[PDB]
Amino acid sequence: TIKDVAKRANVSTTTVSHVINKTRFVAEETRNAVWAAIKELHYSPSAVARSLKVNHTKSIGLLATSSEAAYFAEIIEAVEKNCFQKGYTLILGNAWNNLEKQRAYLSMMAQKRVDGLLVMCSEYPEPLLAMLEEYRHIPMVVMDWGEAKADFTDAVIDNAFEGGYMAGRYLIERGHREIGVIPGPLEQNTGAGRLAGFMKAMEEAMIKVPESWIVQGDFEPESGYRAMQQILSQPHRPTAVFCGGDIMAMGALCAADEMGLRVPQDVSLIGYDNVRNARYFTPALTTIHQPKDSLGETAFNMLLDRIVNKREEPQSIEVHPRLIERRSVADGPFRDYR
Amino acid sequence: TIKDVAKRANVSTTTVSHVINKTRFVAEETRNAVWAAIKELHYSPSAVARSLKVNHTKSIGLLATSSEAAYFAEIIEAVEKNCFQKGYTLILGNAWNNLEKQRAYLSMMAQKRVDGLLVMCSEYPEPLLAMLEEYRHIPMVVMDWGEAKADFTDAVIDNAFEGGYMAGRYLIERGHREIGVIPGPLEQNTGAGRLAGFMKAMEEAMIKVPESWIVQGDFEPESGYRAMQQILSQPHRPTAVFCGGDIMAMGALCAADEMGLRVPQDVSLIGYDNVRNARYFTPALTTIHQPKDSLGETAFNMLLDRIVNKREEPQSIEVHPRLIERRSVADGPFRDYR
DNA sequence: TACGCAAACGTTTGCGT
DNA sequence: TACGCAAACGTTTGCGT
Ligand SMILES: Nc1ncnc2[nH]cnc12
Ligand SMILES: Nc1ncnc2[nH]cnc12
What we know:
2 copies of one chain form a homodimer.
Chain A: H1 2-9, H2 13-21, H3 28-40, H4 47-54, E1 59-64, H5 70-85, E2 89-94, H6 99-111, E3 116-119, H7 126-133, E4 140-145, E5 154-157, H8 160-173, E6 179-182, H9 189-204, H10 221-232, E7 240-243, H11 246-258, E8 268-273, E9 286-289, H12 292-308, E10 316-318, E11 322-324
Parallel strand pairs in A: 1-2, 1-3, 3-4, 4-5, 5-10, 6-7, 7-8, 8-9
Antiparallel strand pairs in A: 9-11
Helix pairs in contact in A: 1-2, 1-3, 5-12, 6-7, 8-9, 10-11
The structure holds adenine (2 copies).
One adenine (ADE) binds at residues 69, 71-72, 122, 188, 190, 219, 245, 273 of chain A.
Chain A binds a DNA duplex through helix 2 and helix 4.
């Protein structure tokens, strides 16, 4: 079809190409006509064709887990923002922690010849790690590991452990000593990681958390509801609770209200993520904030580096969580005794 | 690189191709070797190359507005689900209601040669309609219009008006006659549409809504907070409020709590959307539910039809909202008098 | 000076035999 | 019977002149 344009303009396609890509000098005169034709012909340069010669599609694939969950959602939108301004095209794929689904999208991606790969799989078993490696050839970065699980990728690490530790400390310094927790899937970094961080703070305080006070969640509002319930649904209950994620917390808030418990007057709740609208939780959620934007930006960045500056050596960049004081927590019984 | 495979197997690439695509019969023997090589060579058929001959990329572009907002998010995830199972690749682009941004993504899309186009732009001014038409050639469907704005697209219509009407009716039948409303951007269908529907119910009831009781929102939690405030922040206030979107409502809930108002005992609130987690609002939100999944499914479907069955004539498919009773509403002063 | 030729990028596919 | 040839799809780009 460029052939069709070169003709209208009565010049070589090479020429057409050159003016389209400003890749060498062209007569104004000449230039014009081409555009002229480019317009009537209503021309649209085929990227697939181009991508065929130039050897880069100028698009990146997001091998995600899910994309609705507030958390995930924020990141994605971030990453995308980046792709847009640097000319990249985002190909979004949720794998739902389904291996087949993952091997699937992966290969679809390779075939669509993605310039690079962003990875947010939540859980990383050997079987997944393995598949992953078969694609080392294609530049990639995993945005959700605690440490550097592999040598073939760039990694961005959130410090979820120091975040767990922060959340715990706060409780302590507020007077709390009877504290429960609803962690997220221990196979995930944001799960095991955050929890552990929180658990260290307790040991430092010689605070023991009775097993009946820790209930697993999965990050979905419902998981929180159940746990919160289960916790306050017992003879003896904590005076403060640490919730591994904002949404689940939102779930733990609802349930307390429903058991007619008061927050924070009856129970104190600290969450984790600081999702765009935790502020509008009732009451306004006190939580640890994860820098989701920077997280995305930093991932798309390391990736571009590898891409353009053809880097070979794996990289890894830390990012830092931080406490956000809201209205869901209140001084515990030992505040004044410290 | 297929050339590299044909060689290992010592057969024609045509052959390699044939066994890869099961496009004609091949000796088991022959078949094997190819795979054999296909494996060692660690081969990955280039879709760009293929897409070049076959003339279809097997990917669809989502020209969205935003992708974080719960609403949007749910849809997208839906649509994507569909693309995955029918082999399509999703290219997601948020235009933020920025014309340039839109013309941009659009053309990027055309160039990436998308098999079809899904459109969720929120607002549609002539300038946007116009650009849009320049792409009639590429099959497309707009998932957020009230009626059929154009003749060159397939449309799926939500019936947001009948939804507004439903929400109003409910209030009425619950005993309410003093009711306020926080609508969303009147330029959007889910804005003007829903409101109007609600407004008809009032006229039918000879209920007049004083201007001081209607406050625009933008769908973001914050907009709701302000409005809710503004409303209850007056000498005379409604006994019930209709909120154009769940998130904003969530915002209107927070504010009441903060002005120490009780919901629903002090104010009744009905929202709109029934987002995945409105159930976990505090209190559990009573709202109108939009079938977001079916919405996506139905869009990806009409689109596939056009695509595959090369349809030419625009189509349009209705979808229906429905009331979801929760805990945010309570009988008003006239319940017993009817 | 300002431009055009033709090979190449990696596939699929109509004819053949 | 089971397979191979070669043209084509739409670009970019190293040489030329
Ligand atoms: N996997 C996950 N899902 C939702 N919110 C999260 N916060 C941290 N990890 C998360
Ligand atoms: N544009 C929009 N944003 C968020 N929620 C919505 N519900 C209906 N339309 C919406």
